[PDB]
Amino acid sequence: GVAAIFGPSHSSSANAVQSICNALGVPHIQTRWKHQVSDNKDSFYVSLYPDFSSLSRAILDLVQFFKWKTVTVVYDDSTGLIRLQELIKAPSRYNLRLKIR
Amino acid sequence: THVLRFGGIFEYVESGPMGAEELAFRFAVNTINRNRTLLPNTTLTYDTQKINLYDSFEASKKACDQLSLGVAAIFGPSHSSSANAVQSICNALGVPHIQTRWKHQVSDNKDSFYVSLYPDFSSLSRAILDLVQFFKWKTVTVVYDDSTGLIRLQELIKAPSRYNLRLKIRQLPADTKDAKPLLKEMKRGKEFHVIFDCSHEMAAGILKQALAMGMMTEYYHYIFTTLDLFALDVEPYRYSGVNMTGFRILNTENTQVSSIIEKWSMERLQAPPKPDSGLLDGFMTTDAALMYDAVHVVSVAVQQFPQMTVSSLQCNRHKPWRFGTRFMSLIKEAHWEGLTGRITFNKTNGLRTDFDLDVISLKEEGLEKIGTWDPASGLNMTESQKGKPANITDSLSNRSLIVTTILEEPYVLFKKSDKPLY
Amino acid sequence: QLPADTKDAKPLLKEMKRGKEFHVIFDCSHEMAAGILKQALAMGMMTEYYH
Ligand SMILES: *[C@@H]1O[C@H](CO)[C@@H](O[C@@H]2O[C@H](CO)[C@@H](O[C@@H]3O[C@H](CO[C@H]4O[C@H](CO)[C@@H](O)[C@H](O)[C@@H]4O)[C@@H](O)[C@H](O[C@H]4O[C@H](CO)[C@@H](O)[C@H](O)[C@@H]4O)[C@@H]3O)[C@H](O)[C@H]2NC(C)=O)[C@H](O)[C@H]1NC(C)=O
Ligand SMILES: *[C@@H]1O[C@H](CO)[C@@H](O[C@@H]2O[C@H](CO)[C@@H](O)[C@H](O)[C@H]2NC(C)=O)[C@H](O)[C@H]1NC(C)=O
Ligand SMILES: *[C@@H]1O[C@H](CO)[C@@H](O)[C@H](O)[C@H]1NC(C)=O
Ligand SMILES: *[C@@H]1O[C@H](CO)[C@@H](O)[C@H](O)[C@H]1NC(C)=O
Ligand SMILES: *[C@@H]1O[C@H](CO)[C@@H](O)[C@H](O)[C@H]1NC(C)=O
């Protein structure tokens, strides 16, 4: 008997607990970014982490304030491309020259 | 042994025909039961259940329902949110979990009991990257549809750090295939060499927007990352002069492999048509070709192991299955000349990273094979064509005109200097 | 000249691509101007280079 679930903090472990909280009704408060699938029809959760859909505007505002033309974006795990996808689509509109490593 | 029940977790079409992957799982069991050559004294029985494909609580309940009455494999829920939930149930219980669809393997997964019959994109992304170097490109415009499509092509995005490609990564609109404000930007950017990463439903849909825009001509090349170009209607696009290169793994040239495809259109016999979509007859696409292989590769491993008496395992009181560790290796070192080429798994993972592709392209006579990719060799193109004599001219050039010239005073004499003269 | 009555004018329009002929002055009826332009779309000839 609980009134919340506080966010097991993974991408594979959080998605499994989220759909349990959706079917049972209890809220699922997350504190870490997660690859939220475009059609997971769940709204019984809140995600208290600054979303990389908006935080990667801020890196994009910062790399055009310093006027960089030769950025060299370096991630560590393959879910880092989802985090910075608003920055990787930026040479299609600005004059950045990315080089992802 | 005896009955040897399998398990299946499939989609929820909701008052129509059953899915493409579900008939392919039910056509494969009915074929092996009647052919007494493969699996002689067994009789395979299937158990299929229905989930929403997006609910990892229904996929976890309908897995532990099948694990309760006894299965010997779980043939995949085929979606990233719910495949990872059934994978870890199959890990804690022992029973294998045969997958026919690419999901993101999380790096610290530590899961032993799964194999994936979909060709892994560590090898496919090194096969687009050799078609952007055989065709000698410098400007590519990789287009995907959802945010997972960056992970599928991550060995294509890490390419300008080794070569001279200049990627211009774009994204289709959210789900609507009215991608004209995308394609208006691709005309003004002079982007001729697009590398679409759609499905075969959207590669039939974006190309009707690329024909309404003035973009299906001889100036545009299109590499597709779908293994279903052969089931694509290309009758409007054949005379344009376009180039539509891609891949297919399904052996539509072999006799025993092609004959099952017309048996597939015979047993289906309705294949619910949509003549304004841009797709051909069903043709047993790669999503359903692999499920026909997934039953046979396991059927090899039960042929080589006649000790399986499938027992009733719980889900809340989980106990590892008795023959779980022994039987999982027989799936993983199995080999089968199936529909999709040879089937061998990467013995570290359980991922197909060794597989034969064909490099089919669009010509004026249809959509024809031009080569063959092979991960050991590379592009073995069968380029070697005659349809028109060679492009402009060959090279006659400098030749440097060597001159026989002796040294002699003030005609030809050496120079004296301080620094060396060469 | 278009082929006799059949609107399958693709061997005409193949010659008009190789001749670099961008500025065509069709003298059809409105039944054939609806018919040749579906052959000029199946050929790669309905773009911004053609008037
Ligand atoms: C599945 O099992 C396979 C083998 O059984 C494991 O091997 C991986 O896959 C290939 C096969 O060797 C490797 O990729 C190849 O690397 C060559 C050079 O890359 C080197 O570069 C770095 C530094 O730049 C080195 O440090 C490193 O050691 C690499 O070896 C490329 O030239 C190859 O390209 C050619 O082969 C591909 C086939 O994939 C074809 O498209 C063409 O013929 C192309 O010319 C290729 O890129 C890869 O490095 C191997 N290792 C890893 C870790 O991926 C896999 O490990 C295993 N899969 C897993 C564990 O997921
Ligand atoms: C790319 O497209 C070109 C046409 O734009 C193809 O070249 C033609 O191939 C057909 C084969 O039947 C013939 O008409 C000629 O050999 C070619 N025509 C011209 C004008 O060159 C080419 O084969 C395509 N290449 C690939 C890899 O798809
Ligand atoms: C049974 O399968 C074999 C290959 O395993 C194949 O030749 C055919 O489909 C079947 N054999 C006969 C004699 O029908
Ligand atoms: C038929 O079943 C028996 C079990 O009594 C088994 O030993 C035999 O191998 C089976 N036949 C074939 C051809 O496998
Ligand atoms: C490529 O395919 C041809 C076709 O028969 C074959 O002879 C050849 O051995 C293959 N490999 C290479 C490296 O050319």
Indicate the helix (H) or strand (E) that contains B119: strand B115-119
Contact B84 A12 (CB under 8 A): yes
B197 and B115 in a common domain: no
Amino acid at B421: L
The answer as to whether B296 is a domain residue is yes
**What φ, ψ does residue A11 adopt, rounded to 5°?**
-105, -30
Amino acid at C23: H
**Backbone interruptions in chain C following residues (C to N > 2.5 Å):** none
Nearest CB to B218 within list C44, C46, C48: C44
B112 and B58 in a common domain: yes
Q: Is A69 on the interface with B (CB under 8 A)?
A: no
The answer as to whether B347 is a domain residue is yes
Determine the length of chain B.
Answer: 422
- The CA distance from B96 to B26, in Å, is 19
At B9 the three-state DSSP class reads strand
B243 and B346 in a common domain: no
The structure tokens listed for B28 are: 């494969």
The answer as to whether B398 is a domain residue is no
At A45 the three-state DSSP class reads strand
Asked if residue B170 lies in contact with residue A89, where contact means CB atoms within 8 angstroms, the answer is yes
The answer as to whether B165 is a domain residue is yes
- The CA distance from B283 to B199, in Å, is 16
Q: How many domains does chain B have?
A: 2
Q: What residues pair up with B243 in beta bridges, in sequence order?
A: B221
Chain C interface test: which of B211, B217, B233 (most C C-beta within 10 Å)? B217
Nearest residue on chain B to A53, alpha-carbon basis:
B147
B12 and B73 in a common domain: yes
B266 and B240 in a common domain: no
Our measurement of the distance from residue B2's CA atom to the centroid of its chain's CA atoms, rounded to an integer in Å, reads: 35
The answer as to whether B388 is a domain residue is no
Nearest to B246 by CA among B223, B262, B221, B263: B223
B335 and B277 in a common domain: no
- The CA distance from B9 to B22, in Å, is 9
Asked if residue B142 lies in contact with residue A91, where contact means CB atoms within 8 angstroms, the answer is no
Give the number of other CB atoms < 10 A from CB of residue B129.
20
* Beta-carbon-side half-sphere exposure of residue B153 (alpha carbons within 13 Å): 26
Task: Spell out which residues of chain C touch residue B190, defining contact as CB-CB under 8 Å.
Answer: none
- The CA distance from B14 to B7, in Å, is 20
Whole domain around residue B347: which residue ranges? 1-119+249-270+284-354
Nearest CB to C47 within list B217, B236, B242: B217
Distant-in-sequence, close-in-space partners of B107: CB < 8 Å, separation ≥ 6: A77, A78
| CA dihedral (B97, B99, B103, B109) positive or negative | positive
- The CA distance from A6 to A31, in Å, is 8
Q: Which residues of B389-403 are buried (b: 16+ CB within 10 A; e: fewer)?
A: eeeeeeeeeeeeeee
- The CA distance from B95 to B72, in Å, is 6
The answer as to whether B317 is a domain residue is yes
Q: Is C16 on the interface with B (CB under 8 A)?
A: no
The answer as to whether B421 is a domain residue is no
Q: Report the greatest alpha carbon distance in chain B.
A: 107
* SS3 per residue for B310-366: CCCCCCCCCCCCCCHHHHHHHHHCCCEEECCEEEECCCCCCEECECCEECCEEECCE
B197 and B66 in a common domain: no
Helix axes B58-69, B80-93, angle to 10 degrees: 30
The answer as to whether B215 is a domain residue is yes
B103 and B13 in a common domain: yes
B76 and B31 in a common domain: yes
B153 and B176 in a common domain: yes
The last residue of a domain, from among B337, B354, B371? B354
B364 and B224 in a common domain: yes
Q: Report the greatest alpha carbon distance in chain A.
A: 56
B213 and B91 in a common domain: no
**Alpha-carbon distance values, A23 to A17, A28, A42, B384 (Å):** 10, 11, 9, 60
